[PDB]
Amino acid sequence: PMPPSEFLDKLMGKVSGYDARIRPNFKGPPVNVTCNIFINSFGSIAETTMDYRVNIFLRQQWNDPRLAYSEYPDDSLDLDPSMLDSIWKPDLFFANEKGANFHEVTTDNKLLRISKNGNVLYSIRITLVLACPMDLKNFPMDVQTCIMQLESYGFTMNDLIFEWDEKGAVQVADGLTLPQFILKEEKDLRYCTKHYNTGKFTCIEARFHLERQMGYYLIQMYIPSLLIVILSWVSFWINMDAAPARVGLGITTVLTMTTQSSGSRASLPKVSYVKAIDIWMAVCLLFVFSALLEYAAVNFIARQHVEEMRKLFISRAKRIDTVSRVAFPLVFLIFNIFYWITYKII
Amino acid sequence: PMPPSEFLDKLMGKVSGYDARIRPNFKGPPVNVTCNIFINSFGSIAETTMDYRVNIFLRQQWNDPRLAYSEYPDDSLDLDPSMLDSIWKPDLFFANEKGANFHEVTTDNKLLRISKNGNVLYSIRITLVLACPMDLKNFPMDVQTCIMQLESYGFTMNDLIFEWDEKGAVQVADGLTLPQFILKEEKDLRYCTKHYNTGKFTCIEARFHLERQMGYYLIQMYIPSLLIVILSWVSFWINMDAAPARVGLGITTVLTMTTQSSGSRASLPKVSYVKAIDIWMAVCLLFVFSALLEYAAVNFIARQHVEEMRKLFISRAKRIDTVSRVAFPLVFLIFNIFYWITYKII
Amino acid sequence: PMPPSEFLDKLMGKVSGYDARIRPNFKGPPVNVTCNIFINSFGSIAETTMDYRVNIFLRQQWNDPRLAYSEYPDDSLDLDPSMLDSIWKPDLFFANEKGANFHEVTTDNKLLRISKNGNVLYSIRITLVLACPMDLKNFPMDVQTCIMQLESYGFTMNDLIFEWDEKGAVQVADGLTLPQFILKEEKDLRYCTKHYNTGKFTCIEARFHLERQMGYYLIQMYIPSLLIVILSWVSFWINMDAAPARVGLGITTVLTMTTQSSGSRASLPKVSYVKAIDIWMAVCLLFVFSALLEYAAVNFIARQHVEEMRKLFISRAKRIDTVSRVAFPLVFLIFNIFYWITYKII
Amino acid sequence: PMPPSEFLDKLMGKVSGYDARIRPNFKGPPVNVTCNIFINSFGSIAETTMDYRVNIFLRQQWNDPRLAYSEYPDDSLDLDPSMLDSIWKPDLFFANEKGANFHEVTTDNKLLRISKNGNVLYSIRITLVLACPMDLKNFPMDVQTCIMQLESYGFTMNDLIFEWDEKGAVQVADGLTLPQFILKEEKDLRYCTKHYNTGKFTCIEARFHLERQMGYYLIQMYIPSLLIVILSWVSFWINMDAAPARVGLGITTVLTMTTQSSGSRASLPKVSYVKAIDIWMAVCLLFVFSALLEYAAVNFIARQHVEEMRKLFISRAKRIDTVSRVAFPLVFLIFNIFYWITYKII
Amino acid sequence: PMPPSEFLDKLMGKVSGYDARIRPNFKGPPVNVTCNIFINSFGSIAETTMDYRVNIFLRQQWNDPRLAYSEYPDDSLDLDPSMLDSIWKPDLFFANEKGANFHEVTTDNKLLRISKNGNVLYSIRITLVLACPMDLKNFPMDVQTCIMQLESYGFTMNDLIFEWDEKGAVQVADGLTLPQFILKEEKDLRYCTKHYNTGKFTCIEARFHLERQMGYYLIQMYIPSLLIVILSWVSFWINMDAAPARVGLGITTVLTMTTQSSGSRASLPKVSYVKAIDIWMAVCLLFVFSALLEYAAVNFIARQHVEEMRKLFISRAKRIDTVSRVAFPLVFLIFNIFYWITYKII
Numbered sequence A, B, C, D, E: 001p002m003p004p005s006e007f008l009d010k011l012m013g014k015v016s017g018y019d020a021r022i023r024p025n026f027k028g029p030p031v032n033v034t035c036n037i038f039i040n041s042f043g044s045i046a047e048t049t050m051d052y053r054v055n056i057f058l059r060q061q062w063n064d065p066r067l068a069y070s071e072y073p074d075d076s077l078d079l080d081p082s083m084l085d086s087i088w089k090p091d092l093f094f095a096n097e098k099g100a101n102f103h104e105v106t107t108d109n110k111l112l113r114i115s116k117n118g119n120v121l122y123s124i125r126i127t128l129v130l131a132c133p134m135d136l137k138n139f140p141m142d143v144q145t146c147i148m149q150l151e152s153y154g155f156t157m158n159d160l161i162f163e164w165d166e167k168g169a170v171q172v173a174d175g176l177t178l179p180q181f182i183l184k185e186e187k188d189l190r191y192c193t194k195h196y197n198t199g200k201f202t203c204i205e206a207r208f209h210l211e212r213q214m215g216y217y218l219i220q221m222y223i224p225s226l227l228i229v230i231l232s233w234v235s236f237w238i239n240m241d242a243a244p245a246r247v248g249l250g251i252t253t254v255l256t257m258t259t260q261s262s263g264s265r266a267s268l269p270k271v272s273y274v275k276a277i278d279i280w281m282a283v284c285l286l287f288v289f290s291a292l293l294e295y296a297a298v299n300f301i302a303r304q305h306v307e308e309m310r311k312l313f314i315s316r317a318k319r320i321d322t323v324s325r326v327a328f329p330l331v332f333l334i335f336n337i338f339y340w341i342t343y344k345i346i
């Protein structure tokens, strides 16, 4: 017999009237193309530009009666990736590409096989940098949901319809790990049918829940953010007579805590709303600032102190020192409870 | 009958004398091309290079009598995006491109349909990085106006005219949100007809008002910029005898405020004029510097103090301490009123 | 006779039925392609994106009976790199490309020679940026293993099989040096046969062990990380009466050590687990923090001190000063032993 | 009649012997090509790499007798930008390109019109990143001169000559503003004829004077650079008995001034010569360092002070304090005059 | 007669049997191609990636008897750069490209002329980013030697040999200046013949000595690195009774010197060996650390001081103060001599 390359020349050549500019089943029902992606590499999720780089295998399957051969004895004929400009292909595109490219390492990474009944498998490797609106109302304890939509651009709903297959619409790699987030096993599948001034177009999308890993932020901006508050608590255990001791403590600590506040949003987007890490530094900033005002109240009584009425001012300046050793270690603990409970339920 | 691919070969082939290098209605009136864009993604507005990345759908509509078919029973014939090099297309370009590229993810993102009367719709996806002169006279409270002009390069006014359509000249996406700014619903539409040494060319543009969100700057460079001034106010409530207490306070605070001034223009363009954030740090720098000179005036009187005339110098050195507790908390409030009123009207 | 260019036109032209879209030995055994790479340049191994740039010479050898000439008197015929689109080539690709490109400096860097029996050598220069999961459980003393897999995309196992040659499967350059790591002479060779929903494909890979050089981290983040702890030890040799001396020492040192902790993960990925450099700064942070609490215990006894019972409190406040000069210099040495032994065996 | 597309096929087709590989007026005088650029966008002038990005409209005009039509009734025939590979074009190139690209947004931005006498206008949009040797002998008050040369590569002087036109050789945009520098209205026009081992080639260039705007540097690195010196002057108004007051002032200020010196060359090229900003920080570093040595001379006399001869040492230690309040405020003013006069004339 | 474009069609057309896939002098001696480069732009030598960007004019000259015309009366025929795909060209490539590109600004920057005897000149503009192993054993006083090799990829030694010409093998631009380094006039020329598993290939290279300019490092990291040591010397001229004076001096200076050590390797590669700038900061770190231990020895004697034996401890605590004023100013000078002598000979 003849090889599949010469066998398909009768179906993709000048004979049989086959044209790559004509969609299958013309003047009839639209083409129902089913798609399924395979995430190979994931990560590099930046927040300054609010985008993430993904590498998926976009599989496409449809039905073309013009390529339904019945003379070849086999059931699957592989095609050279250099002959993709001869058959019709869906005009699939993403609405959040923001720059993309293919891979042509020694061969155009394309897969093309034709079944006997007319099933055509089209799998290619695409490297996308997808964008998603980052919701940072609770930055250290948020559940991001970055989606990706597959719309049409040249054909409307009556000519091309995208759908998901029931046999693993979205597969995940075996050893796919992320440096900062984690990929949940549950991925939603809903439609995203858009409507413009020209018409209506099909759209398919899949939700991806990306939960953060609190192990990183808990060590860098939570343990040092708590030890600095302890530095302001040791001033109560120091005598009220040493002026340079408690003054230098209430100033060097209250100024190095601002660096922690400025160092908590160094690589974060400039959002207007307040996040969960801005209420942890601001409240702890009040503790390192109230300790400065605490010494300002103790030193103000000692500098004012008549022999009987002045002996009570010394005890009054020391009575507040007996409560500050218990108030702040018990008030900061109350805020430490309302913080790790409210942001663990919402 | 015959498919539209073979039907349009009579209108785009060697027959009928149709050439892609000839504009419609030659030796007559110019081609009136109407355009309308659809902003899909917006943001990433940097200030060091004074540019912003945009992703729009550039729709183009004109009239070509050479493509006015009258035999096909339908009213809209979709075209393959691979056949855009056969018909005439307007030479539309932007005067502020500064690098651009198309999107060819599995298909050239182009839309092409031809009506019966000769209406040709041309919609493509372009990713532009547009530039605009940043007016930073009031940096935290400015209303930026970044525009984009669509000029001609090969045809003059007598051969190609660009205009805006009245049915939604500029559409906005449904869920288009910006991280730093906000997009106003009012967009101006005016002409930008340029004149060069070669001739005159058409030009269409649309204004985009981008108001900032003060919620970000109010927390990072306004709350810490005010608490440092309070650190210089607590020196008045400290006795005038402790030298290392008030000296270290008037130096560590006046030097950490300069870091806030240098940290306020870390990612800003090097403009010559003064902005609204440079007058907030410089005036607050005077308060943290006047407190240093305030102790220099109190300590200078105590070191100079004859038994009757010296008792008044001690009261004089304490009389200024009774006014500094009221002057600065009431003078900084006056500047706090004139600042948030002048920059809220202009 | 005729030159090899005209001699091979009979084997690569329209005659002999040779087609570049047909794999050798069709309807029979699969093509056994042996590959061997030659690493020219290596390094630039970043950790923020977890990727490294490599430049190898990908050699490919297979058997094509359709190109087995028997009339030319020579044994090796060199081919012009501009004629690679006429013969069949394996669709080799990498599963961790993440962007790649060729080199076309004055000539496409391709090698093509055909033997008499049908051996075809295919060598090209590819610049890859390969990714690997960075295991940073012990950051300064880890042995990274970055691999690279060569999979198929268009042909399954029954049509294309990749294998390694026994004569130097992976060669190393003569003067290939790395700035940070070192390349070990032992490189493992194992298979990576994947299985997808479409079928099974061949895969070959080679392990690369990249041991770090501790000479860099030992000087920058280990010598200064130890001298700061010595600054907290000198407070014991200072009299317990000078308050501003020991207070300023226990605060300026405990706050500059946090900068060393924040400066140890400035260009590191945001991992959740704790690494070996996070337990060296945190434990040393306890020493510079216990010295602050040590003075808080000595000053608390002196401020409390009845004529006979008060003379023992002065000796008690000095007895701890006689143990702190020996405890911390001997407790930090114990942690210094358990650290450099546990992380030198695992 | 026939359209210009079919009319010019007789002049650009196989007939008439017109070839795009032959320069006009062969075996005779060279082609005198006149050029004129139009700067659209300017700025982004970095100093680390010593380059600036420019966007100009390169117009080219020459004479081609082979295209001198005499049958068409019009005087200017516009050409499709897709037919630039049919006529001869000058091989113009820049000697300081360092990477460049064109703009192909929906159309190749090319202009091509042919006059009756043979005048051919060629205007294209080129985005260049031009380099210039940065002369930073006086960094805040220099007048940079970045030029751009247009050389030939394939034709020598006897075959191609570039010249400037007298009617606006270099035009400037109407609203072209720069963020840091300013563009002067005077632009020099001189030749740059080079000589290599192959021969001599034509060259045209234009000088661009880029004066800096001192409004930026005067606020960031000149006002804080002067207030720190004032902090060292207030130590003279403090009593000579307070040791921790004047010691901490002469150390915290002398160390934060070094940050201003290191912060003045953070984004500057590593040049060997000294600039005008390195002599302003180094001299001011002497003032904040002489104040430290001033207290070292006052405290050395007080610690040495026999009942009559010791009373003069106290007055001697205070006599220098009466001159330091007048010397430094009058010596720093002398350097402040010689600085803003020498660098305002050269 | 006929123009050179039509004259060379007889030598580059279907007639005469000329093929671009055949090297000259086949079945005979190899082609001796002589090359000579012309460095136009040089600099941008980074150290994090260990690469430098260069822009050279790669001239190539060989002998092709098939192009030896004898009928044209001239001696040099210029060729259009669009016809380089018709003649044979050497497959020259660099072994350290790491990404490269050509320049196509309005014309492919290629030079092609053919002599009567068969001499063919081939000059193109290539922008390379070449790599070299940075030897940083003495960072401020090293002599870097970055080379560039021109190897073959498709032809072995018996088919293509590269050589250097004796008439200026490597030329330098007239006004080529470097921001950091300097280019020496002496450039070595040696061979780099490599040997692989396939065979042996020709190779030509040229050495480039790049000496650093010490004027930059001497001001930024050598003058401030010496003044901080002077701050530790002034503590000896202060009385031994002021505790907060000498304690704060021996801590604030010893901690700001570590920033100079961390600030000396901010943009340097992470090498394991010690460089010449790491022994200048570490030794100076001992001086600012020995001054802290010097006060720890003086204060330890004063706190210990029986009426006759205690008067000698006061003199002993002051005797070391009389030697420290002379020891350190004379020991640091000894290290200052051995440093600037050992690194000025090797």
Ligand SMILES: *[C@@H]1O[C@H](CO)[C@@H](O[C@@H]2O[C@H](CO)[C@@H](O[C@@H]3O[C@H](CO)[C@@H](O)[C@H](O)[C@@H]3O)[C@H](O)[C@H]2NC(C)=O)[C@H](O)[C@H]1NC(C)=O
Pocket (backbone or CB within 6 Å): A025, A029, A030, A031, A032
């Ligand atoms: C692609 O998928 C669409 C569905 O999304 C298919 O369209 C549906 O096709 C049926 C005929 O097969 C149309 O008729 C209906 O038939 C059912 C019985 O199956 C009957 O109960 C209904 O009353 C109706 O007559 C139906 O209108 C149509 N639906 C839509 C929304 O178009 C289409 O056939 C598929 N195309 C191919 C090539 O498989």
Ligand SMILES: *[C@@H]1O[C@H](CO)[C@@H](O[C@@H]2O[C@H](CO)[C@@H](O[C@@H]3O[C@H](CO)[C@@H](O)[C@H](O)[C@@H]3O)[C@H](O)[C@H]2NC(C)=O)[C@H](O)[C@H]1NC(C)=O
Pocket (backbone or CB within 6 Å): B025, B029, B030, B031, B032
């Ligand atoms: C494209 O749009 C232009 C307008 O911007 C159209 O041009 C105008 O066309 C009219 C004829 O239709 C020209 O004549 C005028 O007619 C009015 C009555 O409608 C009459 O009152 C005037 O006195 C005049 O005779 C008019 O001069 C012309 N204007 C310009 C500025 O060119 C043009 O026809 C449109 N082209 C197409 C193909 O639709």
Ligand SMILES: *[C@@H]1O[C@H](CO)[C@@H](O[C@@H]2O[C@H](CO)[C@@H](O[C@@H]3O[C@H](CO)[C@@H](O)[C@H](O)[C@@H]3O)[C@H](O)[C@H]2NC(C)=O)[C@H](O)[C@H]1NC(C)=O
Pocket (backbone or CB within 6 Å): C025, C029, C030, C031, C032
């Ligand atoms: C490519 O390599 C494969 C092996 O990976 C070759 O396949 C093996 O080929 C033999 C025949 O040569 C097949 O038959 C076996 O022969 C042995 C004797 O050599 C006999 O003991 C066995 O019982 C069996 O009959 C064998 O099944 C086959 N193995 C596989 C896994 O396919 C193949 O021939 C190679 N192709 C070329 C073109 O060299």
Ligand SMILES: *[C@@H]1O[C@H](CO)[C@@H](O[C@@H]2O[C@H](CO)[C@@H](O[C@@H]3O[C@H](CO)[C@@H](O)[C@H](O)[C@@H]3O)[C@H](O)[C@H]2NC(C)=O)[C@H](O)[C@H]1NC(C)=O
Pocket (backbone or CB within 6 Å): D025, D029, D030, D031, D032
């Ligand atoms: C392109 O420009 C060059 C000048 O840069 C033109 O060349 C000059 O052409 C004249 C003839 O037109 C040559 O002859 C001279 O004529 C003058 C009178 O005009 C006479 O006084 C002189 O003694 C001499 O005979 C002249 O040598 C030549 N100069 C050079 C440097 O080539 C050239 O003609 C222009 N080409 C075109 C096509 O316009």
Ligand SMILES: *[C@@H]1O[C@H](CO)[C@@H](O[C@@H]2O[C@H](CO)[C@@H](O[C@@H]3O[C@H](CO)[C@@H](O)[C@H](O)[C@@H]3O)[C@H](O)[C@H]2NC(C)=O)[C@H](O)[C@H]1NC(C)=O
Pocket (backbone or CB within 6 Å): E025, E029, E030, E031, E032
């Ligand atoms: C390209 O350069 C090579 C040299 O690198 C040329 O090869 C040498 O060519 C000579 C003949 O011209 C060969 O023969 C020798 O001749 C000398 C007298 O000149 C004689 O004393 C020797 O005993 C020997 O017979 C020589 O073997 C050969 N050397 C090599 C290494 O190949 C070659 O001819 C040049 N090609 C062209 C086209 O110019």
